[PDB]
Amino acid sequence: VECPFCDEVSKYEKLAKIGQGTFGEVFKARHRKTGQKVALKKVLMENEKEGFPITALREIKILQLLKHENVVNLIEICRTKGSIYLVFDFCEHDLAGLLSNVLVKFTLSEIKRVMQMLLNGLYYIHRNKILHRDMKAANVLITRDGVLKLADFGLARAFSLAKNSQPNRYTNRVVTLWYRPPELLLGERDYGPPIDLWGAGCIMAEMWTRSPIMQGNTEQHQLALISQLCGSITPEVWPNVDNYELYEKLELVKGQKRKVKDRLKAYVRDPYALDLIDKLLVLDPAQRIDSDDALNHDFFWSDPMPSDLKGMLSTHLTSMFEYLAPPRR
């Protein structure tokens, strides 16, 4: 069977597993001729009925559409004469890992550059009518050269730019709990780019806190913490939040006041940074700041200015002795 347009993964040499997923889910590899570092991601099909996963087809279609400096780059789709592999340009680090490793240091300036690339990436995908739907620190990669890439579009979909007519009815259970915006927890099915910016807000907080700020155990619990940090969810700060079916049928604390800046105060410090986080963590999506304005927020245009990530990248080390040994005699 002739197959001139889907090469065998044999052209790459697997080097190592990336992370602790399944048997052969993600592999670091190199092109046998160019030496090009890539990551092979197997299309998982344990659940077989509806054939090739519409979820995979969406990812592929979206990956082939999105081409931008701050979005993960899909090189090609290969096969093993059977599995299918999405081949990506390899990025050495994910943000979740860099932040967990508290030995790595981030200057305010570097944090600025990180958020700038992230917001620029989100602008691009939203401009192209795509919603990421799986924002979280682990899906934000950073290359050895210091370039951030939005990754894992495995749960992304296209949305309609409809200010016009009918209501869209998109899949409601999307986005990891800890990063899920209020509107979704409330049953919203006609959501848009704001669900991703909420995530950009949660991630921004972590740049200082070093770990997810709202780790709910359940949807009801997740809503609890959002109320506790952002302020009770009322029609006063979110007009018409009333109409949500689940608005009633859900335990919902009523006396909470927005404590966003106070709680992050100790961690963040810089007022511009706290203001942007405050605007990103707004309950009502229509009032939540978008990527465009976020990019033009004073945070990115006030001293200290965005800098490259060379410094932060030098604090990432090669082993125990380098991390733990003092710098001297």
Partner: protein, 49 residues
Amino acid sequence: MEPVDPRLEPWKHPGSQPKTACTNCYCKKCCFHCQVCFITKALGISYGR
């Protein structure tokens, strides 16, 4: 056979099923009932044997 607004996102597109059943009649009108009737009746194209 019937124009569809291109600007509609794919999932917002109407189904192609004809509003009425496909008769077995052959006349300038029944031969243009839908794309299927046109292709099979008026052009005599068919996938079966």
